[PDB]
Amino acid sequence: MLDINAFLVEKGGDPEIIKASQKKRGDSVELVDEIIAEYKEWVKLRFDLDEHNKKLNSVQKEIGKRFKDAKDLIAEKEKLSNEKKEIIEKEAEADKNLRSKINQVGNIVHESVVDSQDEENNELVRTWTPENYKKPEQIAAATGAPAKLSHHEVLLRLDGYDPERGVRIVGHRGYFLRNYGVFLNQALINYGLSFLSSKGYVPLQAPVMMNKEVMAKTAQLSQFDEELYKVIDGEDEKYLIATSEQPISAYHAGEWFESPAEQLPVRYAGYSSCFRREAGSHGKDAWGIFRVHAFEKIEQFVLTEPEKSWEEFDRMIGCSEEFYQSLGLPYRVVGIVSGELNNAAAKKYDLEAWFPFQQEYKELVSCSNCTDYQSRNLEIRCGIKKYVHCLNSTLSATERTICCILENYQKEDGLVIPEVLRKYIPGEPEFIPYIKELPKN
Amino acid sequence: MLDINAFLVEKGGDPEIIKASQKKRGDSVELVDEIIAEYKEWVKLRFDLDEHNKKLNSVQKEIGKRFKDAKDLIAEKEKLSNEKKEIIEKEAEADKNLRSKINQVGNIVHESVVDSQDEENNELVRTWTPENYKKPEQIAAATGAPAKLSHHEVLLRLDGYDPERGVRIVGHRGYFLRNYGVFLNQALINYGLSFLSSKGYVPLQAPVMMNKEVMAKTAQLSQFDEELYKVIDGEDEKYLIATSEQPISAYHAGEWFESPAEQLPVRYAGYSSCFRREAGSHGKDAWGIFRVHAFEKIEQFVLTEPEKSWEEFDRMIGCSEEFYQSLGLPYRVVGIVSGELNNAAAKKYDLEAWFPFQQEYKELVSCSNCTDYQSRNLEIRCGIKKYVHCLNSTLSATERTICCILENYQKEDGLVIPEVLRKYIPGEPEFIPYIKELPKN
Ligand SMILES: Nc1ncnc2c1ncn2[C@@H]1O[C@H](COS(=O)(=O)NC(=O)[C@@H](N)CO)[C@@H](O)[C@H]1O
Ligand SMILES: Nc1ncnc2c1ncn2[C@@H]1O[C@H](COS(=O)(=O)NC(=O)[C@@H](N)CO)[C@@H](O)[C@H]1O
Ligand SMILES: Nc1ncnc2c1ncn2[C@@H]1O[C@H](COS(=O)(=O)NC(=O)[C@@H](N)CO)[C@@H](O)[C@H]1O
Ligand SMILES: Nc1ncnc2c1ncn2[C@@H]1O[C@H](COS(=O)(=O)NC(=O)[C@@H](N)CO)[C@@H](O)[C@H]1O
Ligand SMILES: [Mg+2]
Ligand SMILES: [Mg+2]
Ligand SMILES: [Mg+2]
Ligand SMILES: [Mg+2]
């Protein structure tokens, strides 16, 4: 969340900036005034508590002297004490409601972000096409072949996954990966780790379960509602993670980078499976492994000094671009409109790759600067309270990245294996043949 | 479960064999007599239902004729019908209780299994040591160095995992893998897949969630009690899998290998994460990644003709032995006593590898022939009811396999990388240095 003092003009903050941000977000502007009011009530209670302590100390110090009368001093002590009890209770309630309200306020939207609720207004930041690919159309970028099949059709013809047995065993969107489906997924995981490791990222495999209290410090309420699976463990509960961002953001909770010039930035190549209920996503992207309930993801997670996060943000999206360029996948980078930012993000870029069968750009990567919104909550201090900035960016959500590869590397008789992945696959195949026909053809 | 007819002498079965097996298992022998009694009650009801149908048909066929009187035929129809209703209800209840009882009976213990409740009596099947390793002692097998550190100490000195941040974020046994911890885990996963794929196994990545009704057909009750995590999905529930054995065993549920000579055996190299509450395991193996709540495992899963399963069982444990030999890890293979077999297993071998710091053999692999116990429940038919046999065997539970490597590949200044894994790790290191000191030293 934002610092309390950010709401307080008298403390150096600017509530106006916060209201403007709320407006850009399409979120409550009223929250800001309410937060300010409750803060003043809290301060009043704190002063009153202070005064009662002063009176109490004065009174019991008098009782000591008249200990030589003194049922009146006692009568007042009991009075002041009873009042103090009440004040103590109100203060704690006020602090609670104040923090609850502040928790609802999204991070300050960066001035460079387009103010809109309509993704049609996403900023077109950059476009990239591979060599020998004239323009985005219904043509597999890597092979030049007609993009005749969708990703799920390609994967079926390759005998690379099993949605039918998947659905019977797990329910909707359930799947097994098979044969080269497994090998390609592993290839992306290992290439991704190797790729980031070469750039100084530390490989970090995160647990996929988190304690509720920790999850609550890094995920917003809406995620608990329609995103996260709850785990029952005897009499206890945990959550399954939606992204390694969650546990890795808490990795340095309560720690202090007290010599940041030498200690930061810290860069993690996160790897985990990810689990999402997709509770608001019915029917959309029904077949294939494009949108599923469980998937693997190589994540960039970085902590930097507050003064260096914006440069790091550029470095991180640049890292993902280089990764997709290395796979020969056409893409565009877009600046997400204010109305589509989650609470933690001050700025977000998505990399959307070209799917030639769909003939559409589809999101493969989100890259966010969350400044100190999460680190304040997790108490991750920086230097000299000053907190580190946290940024996160997809490197590769592997099953969805496979979908993009499938459409762009297809040809008449099968699938060309992207050159950079070959060394990660037994036999280092350059090409794998279609094994099955589609029922429809 | 076993076939109903197995309990019925008149149907060609031998209840005596089943009672002897129950006794070997240390399980209820009474169950068998009860199952036989309830079957007879069920048969009685079936005959009575049959007779009522005959009478009813006779009666309503008379009512048709007197339709030319006839309130007596009607009075009897209503009588017979009311009786039939009751019989129908009793029959269904009997069938239910009969199957419930049969479900409690473990598979027939193979005659070659030692009859005992005490693992001290496990059969010592085979022992193996690598080259230049005289005998199992407190010496790292691969390097000849003193086995000075436990697996968790080695992993800590390598900065290869983080149990402290793991515990804070997930709770007891929680961990992150870091740096070469991640690379070694991936190395084992990919080597294992490549290894089995070269032997004709089909790589199959299983989903880690299963519908309750399907899980119930392959897991025994005790697993639901202290092993499986339940998942909350809105108003629905699923289970997390304890092993890819579970979903892969259900992969061919309701299918029919009608030309088994050509269609079987079918061999899967299963890969998944695995989740276990270890609810009955408090404090034991407290530190390290030897016994954890989440781990990866490459699994052998095979379906064969009933007449070929015993030969396949030998092939499968042989495959695992070859795998550990290739890693240079000393081990023994033991025939598990009858009293330690789960319900599905007719026979089980464990491969237990030498941990030189612990100076003990520790289980890394279980290999089981479950004959047709699971396939009967999942309706996986074979030829010409005749069901396939199912077998399963660990190839590598990767985190625990890492523990064995750590103790056996340690030397004074760090860890030698097993030769076969080198190609799976960026830089193909032959050795990685200790990075941190232990607090205690
Ligand atoms: N037809 C293909 N077969 C295999 N890999 C391909 C194919 N097309 C593109 N790629 C992969 O995608 C990457 C980007 O390809 S590219 O944009 O066309 N450029 C190049 O190929 C060269 N600039 C470098 O190889 C390549 O390095 C290659 O690994
Ligand atoms: N339900 C899903 N199925 C398959 N892939 C998904 C699913 N949801 C998200 N992804 C993939 O994972 C990527 C990152 O997810 S995200 O929600 O957008 N952002 C994050 O999780 C951040 N931690 C950055 O990775 C998406 O861009 C998409 O490529
Ligand atoms: N000191 C070591 N360094 C790296 N790898 C080792 C070491 N010791 C054993 N291994 C691995 O474990 C395997 C089995 O080793 S062995 O039993 O001693 N036998 C041999 O090394 C030879 N028979 C084949 O290399 C070897 O193939 C090797 O890959
Ligand atoms: N809690 C755990 N933590 C780490 N590894 C475990 C844990 N439980 C089991 N394993 C590893 O997984 C292996 C197989 O597990 S098993 O329960 O014995 N058997 C199975 O699951 C069978 N499907 C065969 O693999 C064990 O031999 C052990 O090496
Ligand atoms: Mg928002
Ligand atoms: Mg996104
Ligand atoms: Mg038993
Ligand atoms: Mg076992």
Swiss-Prot record, chains A, B:
Signal peptide: none annotated. Its EC number is 6.1.1.11. Keywords: Aminoacyl-tRNA synthetase, ATP-binding, Cytoplasm, Ligase, Nucleotide-binding, Protein biosynthesis. The keyword Ligase applies. It is an enzyme of class 6 (ligase). L-serine binds at T243, S244, E245, E299, T394. Pfam families: Seryl_tRNA_N, tRNA-synt_2b. It is found in: Cytoplasm, Cytosol. Its main location: cytoplasm. It catalyses: tRNA(Ser) + L-serine + ATP = L-seryl-tRNA(Ser) + AMP + diphosphate + H(+). InterPro entries: aa-tRNA-synt_IIb, aa-tRNA-synth_II, aa-tRNA-synth_II/BPL/LPL, Ser-tRNA-ligase_type_1, Ser-tRNA-synth_1_N, SerRS_1_N_sf, SerRS_core, tRNA-bd_arm. SUPFAM superfamilies: Class II aaRS and biotin synthetases, tRNA-binding arm. GO terms for molecular function: ATP binding; serine-tRNA ligase activity; tRNA binding. GO terms for cellular component: cytoplasm; cytosol. The keyword Repressor does not apply. ATP binds at R276, R277, E278, V292, E363, L364, V365, S366. GO terms for biological process: cytoplasmic translation; seryl-tRNA aminoacylation. Belongs to the class-II aminoacyl-tRNA synthetase family. Type-1 seryl-tRNA synthetase subfamily. Catalyzes the attachment of serine to tRNA(Ser) in a two-step reaction: serine is first activated by ATP to form Ser-AMP and then transferred to the acceptor end of tRNA(Ser). Consists of two distinct domains, a catalytic core and a N-terminal extension that is involved in tRNA binding. Homodimer. The tRNA molecule binds across the dimer. This is Serine--tRNA ligase, cytoplasmic. The lineage of its organism: Eukaryota, Fungi, Dikarya, Ascomycota, Saccharomycotina.
